[PDB]
């Protein structure tokens, strides 16, 4: 509530960088930006050196600071440090309080230095994707026709394997492929959950596809819609999306999009992958008539930034819901990025409400500014359930509405395995 009122009262400074916005970049040891040097005392609640005077900022290596978009966000996300500095006093047990902005920069509370190559993006974290949109039923369509062979198929196998990493256990996924015949790439044959084990089977069968044959968009799209109408299997009953990976074509498949998607219940996101010379006009039409989006992935460096922006389209119905969409959501148990063990994270998306009373909203105010999270350590949840009074054989345990344990004397701070280890 103090990150939405402040942003609404923000004046867009385009080249006022001479005002010298001041912050503390986490990964350091500039025109328009100063740099704070903290004291960095060492705390026992954390395992690192933390200062309680300001909030650190993480800017990804691929995101250039000192930009008009970035410098504006480091200016209006500066009143947070006053309410960041206020949540702690009531409950001195507060862990990392973080605002994951949509630009890519997070500003966490415990001013603490960041952890070889730093491939961290706040927009891909499970606690951000969970609060950026509702669950989904994504079905991935892969073009394995002849024209995608070579480098294009290499970027497609990586793009499909990189979007699967943007899926939680509340979402259901399945990957198909069409080469004038529509078939699944794996043994599943319907929509399966997106847990760790099922996601490895799908991304291992993707790495074994070969490009050969003519292309048939109509036959591959009937297989997509007909797999989203199953309702025999367990599904999410939420955002139904079809993500088509291809290069280009000359068929719009108007008949198929009216036999199935007449009421526009299924969103179609179309990706044009690779460097080629093909008509992308028909591809953009599918993403416009169906309420989706059109993306281009010309190289490997565009895979990470283009496979996560489909969540700005799925969050449009959530923004317009209003205060009914402000529900705290706790994520699965995961290892903290800043080496704090096993933690769970709260979540509350923030909205763009500039020009709320004066009617100029819904111009760009259909997108979220960012997702705010707060970490609870499992060693804290283990302190409200004392064990030294029952017996050596007695214990507590708790599970999600998924079966996964949140607290149990068999869960160790180490990742779970999915298959035998291989190394070349």
């Amino acid at each position: 509530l103090e990150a939405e009122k402040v942003q609404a009262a923000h004046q867009w400074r385009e080249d006022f960088a001479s005002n010298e916005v001041v912050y503390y970049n986490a990964k350091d040891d500039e025109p328009g930006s100063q740099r704070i040097k903290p004291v960095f005392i060492e705390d026992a609640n954390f395992g690192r050196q933390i200062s309680y005077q300001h909030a650190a900022v993480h800017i990804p290596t691929d995101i250039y600071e000192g930009s008009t978009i970035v410098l504006n966000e480091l200016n209006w996300t500066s009143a947070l440090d006053e309410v960041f500095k206020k949540n702690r006093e009531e409950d001195p047990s507060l862990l990392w309080q973080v605002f994951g902005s949509a630009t890519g920069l997070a500003r966490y509370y415990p001013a603490s230095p960041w952890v070889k190559i730093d491939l961290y993006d706040v927009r891909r974290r499970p606690w951000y994707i969970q609060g950026a949109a509702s669950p989904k039923d994504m079905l991935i369509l892969v073009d394995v026709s002849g024209s995608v062979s070579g480098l294009t198929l290499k970027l497609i196998r990586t793009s499909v394997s990189e979007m699967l990493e943007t899926l939680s256990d509340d979402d259901f996924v399945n990957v198909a492929s069409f080469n004038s015949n529509a078939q699944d790439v794996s043994c599943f044959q319907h929509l399966v959950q997106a847990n760790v084990r099922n996601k490895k089977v799908l991304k291992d069968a993707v790495n074994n596809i070969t490009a050969k044959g003519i292309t048939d968009y109509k036959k591959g799209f009937s297989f997509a819609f007909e797999q989203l109408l199953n309702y025999n299997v367990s599904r999410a009953n939420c955002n139904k999306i079809i993500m088509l990976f291809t290069d280009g074509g000359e068929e719009r498949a108007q008949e198929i999009f009216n036999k199935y998607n007449k009421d526009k219940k299924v969103r179609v996101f179309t990706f044009s992958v690779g460097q080629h010379n093909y008509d992308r006009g028909p591809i953009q039409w599918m993403a416009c008539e169906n309420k989706g989006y059109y993306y281009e992935i010309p190289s490997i460096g565009a895979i990470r930034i283009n496979t996560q922006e489909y969540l700005d389209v799925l969050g449009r119905p959530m923004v317009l819901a209003g205060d009914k969409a402000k529900q705290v959501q706790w994520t699965n148990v995961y290892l903290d990025a800043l080496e704090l063990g096993l933690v769970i994270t709260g979540t509350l998306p923030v909205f763009n409400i500039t020009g709320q009373f004066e009617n100029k909203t819904n111009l760009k105010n259909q997108l979220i500014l960012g997702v705010m999270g707060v970490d609870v350590s499992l060693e804290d949840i283990k302190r409200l359930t004392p064990r030294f009074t029952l017996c050596p054989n007695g214990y507590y345990f708790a599970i999600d509405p998924n079966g996964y344990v949140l607290l149990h004397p068999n869960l160790q701070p180490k990742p779970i395995g999915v298959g035998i280890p291989t190394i070349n």
Binding site: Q284, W285, A287, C288, G292, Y294, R316, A321
Partner: peptide
């Protein structure tokens, strides 16, 4: 048991912002 909340298919949505509208 999946989440009970659901947020999709709102009629005030824009629909006017694809990735090819620019060209």
């Amino acid at each position: 048991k999946g989440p009970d909340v659901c947020f999709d298919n709102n009629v005030l949505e824009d629909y006017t912002d694809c990735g090819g509208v620019s060209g």
